[PDB]
Design a protein around this nucleic acid. Structure first.
Ligand SMILES: [Mg+2]
Ligand SMILES: [Mg+2]
Ligand SMILES: [Mg+2]
Ligand SMILES: [Mg+2]
Ligand SMILES: [Mg+2]
Ligand SMILES: [Mg+2]
Ligand SMILES: [Mg+2]
Ligand SMILES: [Mg+2]
Ligand SMILES: [Mg+2]
Ligand SMILES: [Mg+2]
Ligand SMILES: [Mg+2]
Ligand SMILES: [Mg+2]
Ligand SMILES: [Mg+2]
Ligand SMILES: [Mg+2]
Ligand SMILES: [Mg+2]
Ligand SMILES: [Mg+2]
Ligand SMILES: [Mg+2]
Ligand SMILES: [Mg+2]
Ligand SMILES: [Mg+2]
Ligand SMILES: [Mg+2]
Ligand SMILES: [Mg+2]
Ligand SMILES: [Mg+2]
Ligand SMILES: [Mg+2]
Ligand SMILES: [Mg+2]
Ligand SMILES: [Mg+2]
Ligand SMILES: [Mg+2]
Ligand SMILES: [Mg+2]
Ligand SMILES: [Mg+2]
Ligand SMILES: [Mg+2]
Ligand SMILES: [Mg+2]
Ligand SMILES: [Mg+2]
Ligand SMILES: [Mg+2]
Ligand SMILES: [Mg+2]
Ligand SMILES: [Mg+2]
Ligand SMILES: [Mg+2]
Ligand SMILES: [Mg+2]
Ligand SMILES: [Mg+2]
Ligand SMILES: [Mg+2]
Ligand SMILES: [Mg+2]
Ligand SMILES: [Mg+2]
Ligand SMILES: [Mg+2]
Lengths: 36, 151, 146
RNA sequence: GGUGGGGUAACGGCCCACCAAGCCGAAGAUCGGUACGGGCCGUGAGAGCGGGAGCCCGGAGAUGGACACUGAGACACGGGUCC
RNA sequence: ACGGCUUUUCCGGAGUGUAAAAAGCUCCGGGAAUAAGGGCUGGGCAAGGCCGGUGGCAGCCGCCGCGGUAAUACCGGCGGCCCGAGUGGUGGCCACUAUUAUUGGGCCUAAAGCGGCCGUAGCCGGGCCCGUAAGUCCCUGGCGAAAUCCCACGGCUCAACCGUGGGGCUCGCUGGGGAUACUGCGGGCCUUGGGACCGGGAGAGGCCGGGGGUACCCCCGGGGUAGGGGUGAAAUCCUAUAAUCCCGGGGGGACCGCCAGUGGCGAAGGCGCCCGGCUGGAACGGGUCCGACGGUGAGGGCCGAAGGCCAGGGGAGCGAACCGGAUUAGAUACCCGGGUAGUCCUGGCUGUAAAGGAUGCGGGCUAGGUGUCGGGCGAGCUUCGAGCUCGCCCGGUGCCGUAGGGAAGCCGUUAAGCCCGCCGCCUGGGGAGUACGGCCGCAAGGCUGAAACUUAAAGGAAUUGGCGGGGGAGCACUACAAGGGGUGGAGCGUGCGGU
RNA sequence: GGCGAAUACGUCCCUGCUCCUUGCACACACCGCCCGUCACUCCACCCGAGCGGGGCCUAGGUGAGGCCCGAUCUCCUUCGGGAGGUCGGGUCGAGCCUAGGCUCCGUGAGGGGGGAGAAGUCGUAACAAGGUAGCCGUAGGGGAACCUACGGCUCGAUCACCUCCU
RNA sequence: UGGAGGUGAUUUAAAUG
RNA sequence: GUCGGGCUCAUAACCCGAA
């Protein structure tokens, strides 16, 4: 992924590391269904 | 700055501005040419000959005399050697760099994991290719000349 | 960052390419040249449009205001798309009926869009059965055919 | 691209026979998008940015796609043929 | 309100006008008669702190904002302001906007310097002499239709419009003549930038072989006997098959304490026990050599912490997942007892970090002061040491600070200052580093990267307070500590809630 | 008015207040601010079995019509020939048919996140040392915010000691 | 006077408006 | 589990009594 260091700031949002983990989890599901 | 390491060292020679040889120098041009030929026949580089002439014979550079043949130019060690047929076939700086690259390559055949020394070989070969471009432009190397380590 | 480049006398081509490259970072220029607004406009570039009323509704104002804003759902004659339009004035919603034809135009907010405490509505009613709505709300004129 | 012809009012791969491997391209070919070109017009202190219906000059078309007769001139908006 | 005047315009006529008519124009009779609207009125922004309705309902609002029964902001009356035969609404282009920047913008902390480096094209390139005349400058021939634009004069009553002259416009092309400062091209001559070489030194730079240091875990033998370990407090766990602890031996895998220093070396990532071998780069000293051989660098190439993957080894200590003991309302955790992968070696793949100096690289210039590391020079000491002290030059590495810069924090010859270059990147916040398409990878993943729609701020530096399960100082029987007497249980007096 | 003691001569541990300094995403001022899953309402979008239809390149069959060279026939001639019919051959060609591949619009069972709304729900992750400092890369685990391991950054509070400076 | 770094530590539980 | 009282600005947790 590309770097957006502004996203790492905490005021009014959840932690970016875990947002990234959630996005990657979602992308795995789409790629599996694309194979069927 | 240095071509690759970007350091700003300043050490070097500080030549005074003068036209004629000094009064205390007694050697003539013929003696100087004879000395240059003798030293070259003993097997020295062009840089080494000038060092010996300065240190032992009290001769500040041969570039203080006019060329007896061509009045348009001053004398240099390479010009003197050319006048007698003992001039290097390959320019000396290129030759020294190529010699350094050959020794380093056989070290790397026995030490494949020495990566820091390998970057040094890469930098040396960059210098060699810069020089070959310049010398082909000037006509001091044939147009078909190529540098290949496997040679 | 050093001096802005290229400055050379014979570097015209690179300077022109640099200016062309970074002009696509301007959203105004990109939208106009790619014609993005035309691609998605239900009014198809027109300043006004005609439609038929399908139902009356009410939209809540946004915080921290309170009130109900009266609007209509309109199906446009030219392409059949359905859009929401505001009815300006005190008591204006009483002059509208289902199956009536209206003329609508932009509501006039920033960037050619919505305004005020009612985001989501981009249009307003100007005429009802070919009579000016402003007159009807004030008087001076009567809505025909009952 | 070359050599030898044909055809045309006329030069030409414009089209043929024969002989070669050429020709264009990251300084953007090819393909895709949009559009008739210019004199000019709107705006701005200027540098610029945007447009090119109306008048003049050039181009193209006559429901769509093909093709002929007469004539100095047309493959013809108020002339001919086929789909 | 009186008295008077006029007739552009209006009504009715004659002439002229016209192909014929109509307009227009000259005259005659009548008469102030026939003629004002649209928007706005809280700020921006000119104009009301008046009256009557409505009461977070209805409504207004480009933006900021009004309206919750005493509305200068909504609806209406009366006033007032702007423009005026016009005046308002909606959509588009230019300006606003130095929010596209040649003139003329930004990238430490706000959007933004590729994790690092090498190099191809391109762009930018040191001094002197001679030649040329492509670029460039000057003069003059042939062209760039008219209309459109600017100026003076003239014709319609003036004007708009139209004519006669002067200029501009299509900034573009072409035939000749002249100049040689700069750029380009050709020849010659240099040493300052850069490179080569020689000398005595410095350094955890890299690779390979050998020799060690304690510490720790397991095993065998001797001693001794009831506990050890661990927490805020405990428990699981270990121990009579003799633990914890002490002594004598054997085996194993990882790691190199103190000295150690805003110290050293390297492009960055990174590099610290000793001895030997191979090897990279830099500083200083230099009347040595070559002779502009240079800077940056689209594409392209190489290096690149930890973790992960593929094969084969190894496994002391630690320890994702997991298994137990606790804590708690719950506790999928924090704490405690165990524990697989992994952490280590050999051959490959992956190419990612707050890979941060959050600061791309080369060159010139612009006060000082004071530490420290390497080399050189001078002077003085000296136990004669590769020793010590002071001063100066060059190159690294810190701090304070003048001019200047900046929103400020701060930077300030190790620039974030003034100037000459080249490359990369940014253009309000979100949607989104997502969807679709492509390339690369065994896989995990990497590089490239929109739109519909949503929103008035998001973001930065600094100020005053308030607060902290932050620090310091001080104080009070409506605080404690030391004490004396009680209230809370019963019946009743009295006040409060509810019923 | 009568009678008439006990204990301390201190401390900031508890409950609180004043002042200096420090951190702060708070100013309605910690009774502050604030995050995610599940549930409900609305808007735009993505993947998509099936499902009607359009447009381009190919390869093959067919082909109205045009041109050229031939043989013969009918009618006119000024004897040059000129109108036209039938057949043979060559060649050019719009259209049409079949199949193949891409491309586009329309519906579409089911699946997926995004944005508003206002609160139905469970917890309290971030801001003070936010009560286990926060955050980046990679990997595993969990209703949900999140937790844990290795390497890194300060954009981390407090006390003691040490080092380096002005 | 004022600054920059390093190593050690931090005695239960305490959610919400 | 029910009901009542404490503690808190208040709710949850927590403490006490009772049937
Ligand atoms: Mg010919
Ligand atoms: Mg067109
Ligand atoms: Mg055009
Ligand atoms: Mg027209
Ligand atoms: Mg028609
Ligand atoms: Mg005013
Ligand atoms: Mg308005
Ligand atoms: Mg009122
Ligand atoms: Mg009013
Ligand atoms: Mg700016
Ligand atoms: Mg930034
Ligand atoms: Mg960088
Ligand atoms: Mg380079
Ligand atoms: Mg020069
Ligand atoms: Mg010239
Ligand atoms: Mg003209
Ligand atoms: Mg006149
Ligand atoms: Mg005039
Ligand atoms: Mg005129
Ligand atoms: Mg024993
Ligand atoms: Mg590159
Ligand atoms: Mg263990
Ligand atoms: Mg680092
Ligand atoms: Mg840092
Ligand atoms: Mg960076
Ligand atoms: Mg020294
Ligand atoms: Mg260094
Ligand atoms: Mg220095
Ligand atoms: Mg300073
Ligand atoms: Mg943006
Ligand atoms: Mg993809
Ligand atoms: Mg009390
Ligand atoms: Mg007490
Ligand atoms: Mg009682
Ligand atoms: Mg605030
Ligand atoms: Mg709270
Ligand atoms: Mg918390
Ligand atoms: Mg906690
Ligand atoms: Mg925490
Ligand atoms: Mg876990
Ligand atoms: Mg309670």
């Amino acid at each position: 992924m590309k770097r957006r260091p502004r996203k790492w700031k905490k005021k009014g949002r959840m932690r970016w590391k875990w947002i990234k983990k959630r996005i990657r989890r979602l992308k795995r599901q789409r790629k599996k269904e694309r194979g069927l | 700055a240095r071509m690759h390491a970007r350091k700003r060292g300043k050490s070097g020679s500080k030549r005074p501005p003068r036209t004629a040889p000094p009064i205390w120098l007694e050697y003539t041009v013929e003696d100087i040419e004879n000395l240059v030929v003798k030293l070259r026949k003993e097997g020295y580089s062009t840089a080494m000959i000038g060092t010996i002439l300065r240190d032992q014979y009290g001769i500040p550079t041969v570039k203080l005399f006019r060329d007896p043949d061509n009045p348009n130019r001053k004398l240099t060690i390479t010009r003197i050697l050319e006048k007698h047929g003992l001039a290097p076939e390959i320019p000396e700086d290129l030759m020294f760099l190529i010699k350094r690259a050959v020794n380093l390559r056989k070290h790397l055949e026995q030490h494949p994991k020495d990566l820091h020394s390998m970057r040094g070989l890469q930098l040396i070969e960059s210098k060699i290719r810069r020089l070959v471009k310049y010398y082909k432009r000037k006509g001091k190397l044939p147009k078909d000349w190529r540098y290949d380590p496997e040679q | 960052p050093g001096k802005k480049a290229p400055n050379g006398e014979f570097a015209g081509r690179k300077l022109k390419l640099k200016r062309k490259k970074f002009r696509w970072s301007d959203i105004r220029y990109k939208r106009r040249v790619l014609r993005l607004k035309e691609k998605s406009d239900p009014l198809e570039g027109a300043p006004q449009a005609r439609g038929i009323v399908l139902e009356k509704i009410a939209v809540e104002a946004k915080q921290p205001n309170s009130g109900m804003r009266k609007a209509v759902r309109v199906q446009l004659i030219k392409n059949g798309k359905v859009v929401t339009a505001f009815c300006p004035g005190d008591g204006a919603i009483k002059f509208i009926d289902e199956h009536d034809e209206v003329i609508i135009e932009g509501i006039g907010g920033p960037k050619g869009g919505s305004m005020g405490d009612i985001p989501g509505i981009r249009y307003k009613v100007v005429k009802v059965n070919r009579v000016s709505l402003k007159e009807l709300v004030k008087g001076r004129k009567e809505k025909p055919r009952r």
